Design a protein around this ligand. Structure first.
Ligand SMILES: CC(C)=CCOc1cc(NC(=S)c2ccoc2C)ccc1Cl
Lengths: 416, 534
């Protein structure tokens, strides 16, 4: 219930005209409900055919609910929407013992959207077998998932938070899209309890477990063996040689001199003292991340993933090749054994949130999946309000073999 | 009519059309002058004056009339896609009764944004381009104009809302100038409701007709739709004695469409006739084999294919068969032998892949289709063992998946033709292969040397470097026993290890695959080239 701010698209940019992808019956039924309701609540209005724009819409089941949530894919609109030069990234956020995320998307509907910009929010509810025309709507209020919403609603959000921020100045609160990331060092109990205190507060307007200090960067651990065979060295030499693109001090000269001759692949080879040292120097280089790697706010953040097998995945976040900002391993979550797509999806979300917490922006993903496989099913397992960008790739055999080498816990993360 | 108009506009900064009125005879003009006085009184058009700089050519074919809006259209804004995705017989539900209402004339029943009308101006010529012609313009959606389809449907949608609300148990499908109204009410109650609908429409000026009256079955996408089930409109193959390429291509096209519904259709020999054709009208005699399969097909096509509609209360089952390398067939049903849909996918041919992968692809295409048709995914019955699936997928480099499925022992079963060993083979000969060629002279050598002292080299001409490398791997495979360790510095061999393809675009690779498949144990190892590696 306020006045509206004039929003425009970047110069020369036209509205999105993205086709609605096919939805399951359940998904369509939920949207119809959700949409007649918002229509009645005046948040959206049916539109004519004279409006040519469109944005894909779908429904997710956020953590802990049987109620479906309407999720719109405003990626295209976002990219076309002008800039507002939001909040800078509170570097401190990444140094908290615990960080909790909260969905404040519901705060936006309480704000009117510039009428001149509504045409561009056009979305369509499809019909099964195309027996009914699609139900075309557009927004009247700030939509969840549009970069303009958290922006316009910034002034109101800051106000409603000051009280808590000052009452608790040791806590850090960062907002991204429909999300709010609350970070504090308080013990889990005094933390989670302090969160609800924030909730209740945030709650009196109309709104309703991360550990950054444990996202350590891991080292490559080269195999150590009692006795080495021709094959062992070869496998080794190939990886190290690849690895030399990251660490130029890595060498396989002495080792490759052992690979001289046409002996059987399973034959044991004695390591010359020169070879021994060579391995030792190498293991030392790999004892640390390569120097001179700094994040650049002007660069796009990239996130590559490799399928390791057995529910295992590896990823690296960089902006320039071979200069990782972070790397890690990802094990499938319980109840996902038979689903490659669910595992990948869960991983993309995990990595994106990390990317958000650390740099306050999402990475562009390089995914080891065929476009059709992904597009057919990723939504079935999506739970975030935002959606990162992605491209489908072919994993080079070596990249997988190399990061397969990362170090794991002695035993793991122990707790009775 | 009392229907609100839709605000229309011209594309970004363009101006309305100004194409000159084609010249016509007195016979053609006296006819158009006729038709337009009619439309003019029906309120469809309005005689305008000199205050209009726009114009569209009007023609006269039989004495009917035709306005060429090609120009106006190319200047008219764009509208959100007018239903381009239609229903598929496999997805509609059976109805006790279905009635089709021709609301065609309703095209000229919908008002046109008053503001836009000036652009629809056209001129009825003078007997001899002497006196000024008769100027007019449209007050309603012009037949053949770009925004008519979209606007007519949206308008039809608004009008039908009340009725649709009041009669939930009645389905109305809007297509073109038709309204297919179905229901499971008693035939008298149905007939009664159609009349109520027909009247409701009449209230908005939309008048619908017994003569023109359409009746079931209905022709749709090549099927004849009956209220309780569907059938394939029989397809006839023109028995001739003179086949030109056009005849042969068209034929192959229709046969191709039939392979979806009819089993056993084949075009391999007919396609052979197209080789090296010098022209469309070229007459190519049918070989014997062509005369033959074209004979079996005429038969297969004489068989009546009937089908069933979608019953939401029952399971959706999708069965898949591997009718050949890269070729897949499927049928989706709820009750055994009563298919909703069948079809097959063009032989999947690529750079390099494997049967299990291809399978998952056929599975995803069906799934994408099913989500559209039924908004649900079928339970799959696949000709592959759960073990074969678990072994392949859990280790493949690429993310892949298959929705809930069950194994069905309907040979031929899809399997893993071979599996590279995960560790070197103790006691197996070890071939150190290498190939090299001059990329410019295309001259190269390929060979191997084993820990056992066996050696071989071969000189090749008009070859590429990758081919020599692969041929080196090929010779090792050819010359080794049932178990062999092979080491190469070929980057391509690195892909083969990771993907383990059982089909490739490269004949050489395929030859290699045939060797791989034949061995009992094969360990393929890669090492970087140009090292201290001997
Ligand atoms: C695709 C099409 C023109 C269908 C109309 O004909 C039929 C439709 C149905 N059943 C349904 S669900 C229906 C009724 C009106 O519109 C639809 C989409 C059954 C048999 C026939 Cl013969």
């Amino acid at each position: 219930p306020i006045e509206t701010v004039p929003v425009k698209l970047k110069p020369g940019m036209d509205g999105p005209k993205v086709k609605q992808w096919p939805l399951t019956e359940e998904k369509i039924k939920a949207l119809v409900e959700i949409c007649t309701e918002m229509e009645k609540e005046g948040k959206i209005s049916k539109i004519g055919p004279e409006n040519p724009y469109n944005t894909p819409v779908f429904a997710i089941k956020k953590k802990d609910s049987t109620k479906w949530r309407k999720l719109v894919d405003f990626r295209e609109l976002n990219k076309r929407t002008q800039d507002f030069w939001g909040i800078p990234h509170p570097a401190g956020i990444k140094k908290k013992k615990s960080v909790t995320v909260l969905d404040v998307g519901d705060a936006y509907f309480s704000v009117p959207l510039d009428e001149d910009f509504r045409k561009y929010t056009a979305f369509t509810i499809p019909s099964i077998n195309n027996e009914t025309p699609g139900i075309r709507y557009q927004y009247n209020v700030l939509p969840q998932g549009w970069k303009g919403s958290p922006a316009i609603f910034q002034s109101s959000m800051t106000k409603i938070l000051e009280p808590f921020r000052k009452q608790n100045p040791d806590i850090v609160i960062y907002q991204y899209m429909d999300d709010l990331y609350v970070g504090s060092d308080l013990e889990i109990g005094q933390h989670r309890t302090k969160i609800e205190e924030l909730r209740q507060h945030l709650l009196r307007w109309g709104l309703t477990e991360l550990h950054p200090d444990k996202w350590t960067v891991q080292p490559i651990v080269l195999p150590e063996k009692d006795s080495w065979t021709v094959n062992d060295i070869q496998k080794l030499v190939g990886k190290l040689n690849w690895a030399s693109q990251i660490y130029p001090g890595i060498k396989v000269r002495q080792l490759c001199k052992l690979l001289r001759g046409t002996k059987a692949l399973t034959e044991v080879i004695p390591l010359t003292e020169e070879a021994e040292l060579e391995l030792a120097e190498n293991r030392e280089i790999l004892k640390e991340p390569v120097h001179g790697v700094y994040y650049d706010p002007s660069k796009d953040l990239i996130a590559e993933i490799q399928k390791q097998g057995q529910g295992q995945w590896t990823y690296q976040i960089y902006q320039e090749p071979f200069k990782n900002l972070k790397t890690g391993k990802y094990a499938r979550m319980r109840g996902a054994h038979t689903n490659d797509v669910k595992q990948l999806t869960e991983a993309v979300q995990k990595i994106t949130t990390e990317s958000i917490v650390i740099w306050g922006k999402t990475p562009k993903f390089k995914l080891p999946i065929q476009k059709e496989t992904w597009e057919t099913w990723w939504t079935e397992y999506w739970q975030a309000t935002w959606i990162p960008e992605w491209e489908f790739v072919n994993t080079p055999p070596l990249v997988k073999l190399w990061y397969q080498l990362e170090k794991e816990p002695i035993v793991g993360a122990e707790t009775f | 009519s009392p229907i609100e108009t839709v605000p229309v506009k011209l594309k970004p900064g363009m101006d309305g059309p100004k194409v000159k009125q084609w010249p016509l005879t007195e016979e053609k003009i006296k006819a158009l002058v006729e038709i337009c006085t009619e439309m003019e009184k029906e309120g469809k058009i309005s005689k305008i004056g000199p205050e209009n700089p726009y114009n569209t050519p009007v023609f006269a074919i039989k004495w009917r009339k035709l306005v060429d809006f090609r120009e106006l259209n190319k200047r008219t804004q764009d509208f959100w896609e007018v239903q381009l995705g239609i229903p598929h017989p496999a997805g509609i539900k059976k109805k006790k009764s279905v009635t089709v209402l021709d609301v065609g004339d309703a095209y000229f029943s919908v008002p046109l944004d008053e503001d836009f009308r000036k652009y629809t101006a056209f001129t009825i010529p003078s007997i001899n381009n002497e006196t000024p012609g008769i100027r007019y313009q449209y007050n309603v959606l012009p037949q053949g104009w770009k925004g008519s389809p979209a606007i007519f449907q949206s308008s039809m949608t608004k009008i039908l809302e009340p009725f649709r609300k009041q009669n939930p148990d009645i389905v109305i499908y809007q297509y073109m100038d038709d309204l297919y109204v179905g229901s499971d009410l008693e035939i008298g109650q149905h007939r009664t409701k159609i009349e109520e609908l027909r009247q409701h429409l009449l209230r908005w000026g939309l008048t619908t007709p017994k003569k023109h009256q359409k009746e079931p079955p209905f022709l749709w996408m090549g099927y004849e739709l009956h209220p309780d089930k569907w059938t394939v409109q029989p397809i006839v193959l023109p028995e001739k004695d003179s086949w030109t390429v056009n005849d042969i291509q068209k034929l192959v096209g229709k046969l191709n469409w039939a392979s979806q519904i009819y089993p056993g259709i084949k075009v391999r020999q007919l396609c052979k006739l197209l080789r090296g054709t010098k022209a469309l009208t070229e007459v190519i005699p049918l070989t014997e084999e062509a005369e033959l399969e074209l004979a079996e097909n005429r038969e297969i096509l004489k068989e009546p294919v009937h089908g069933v509609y979608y019953d939401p209360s029952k399971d959706l089952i999708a069965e898949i068969q591997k009718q050949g390398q890269g070729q897949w067939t499927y049928q989706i049903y709820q009750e055994p032998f009563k298919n909703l849909k069948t079809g097959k996918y063009a032989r999947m041919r690529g750079a390099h892949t494997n049967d299990v992968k291809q399978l998952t692809e056929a599975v995803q295409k069906i799934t994408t289709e099913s989500i559209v048709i039924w908004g649900k995914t079928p339970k799959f019955k696949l000709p592959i063992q759960k073990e074969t699936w678990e072994t392949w997928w859990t280790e493949y480099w690429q993310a892949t998946w298959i929705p809930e499925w069950e194994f069905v022992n309907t040979p031929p079963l899809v399997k893993l033709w071979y599996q590279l060993e995960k560790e070197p083979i103790v006691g197996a000969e070890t071939f150190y292969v290498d190939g090299a060629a001059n990329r410019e002279t295309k001259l190269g050598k390929a060979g191997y040397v084993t820990n056992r002292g066996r050696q071989k080299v071969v000189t090749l001409t008009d070859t590429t470097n990758q081919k020599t490398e692969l041929q080196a791997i090929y010779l090792a495979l050819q010359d080794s026993g049932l178990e062999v360790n092979i080491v190469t510095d070929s980057q391509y061999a690195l892909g083969i290890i990771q993907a383990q393809p059982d089909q490739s675009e490269s004949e050489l690779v395929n030859q290699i695959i045939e060797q791989l498949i034949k061995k009992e144990k094969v360990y393929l190892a890669w090492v970087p080239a140009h090292k201290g590696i001997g």
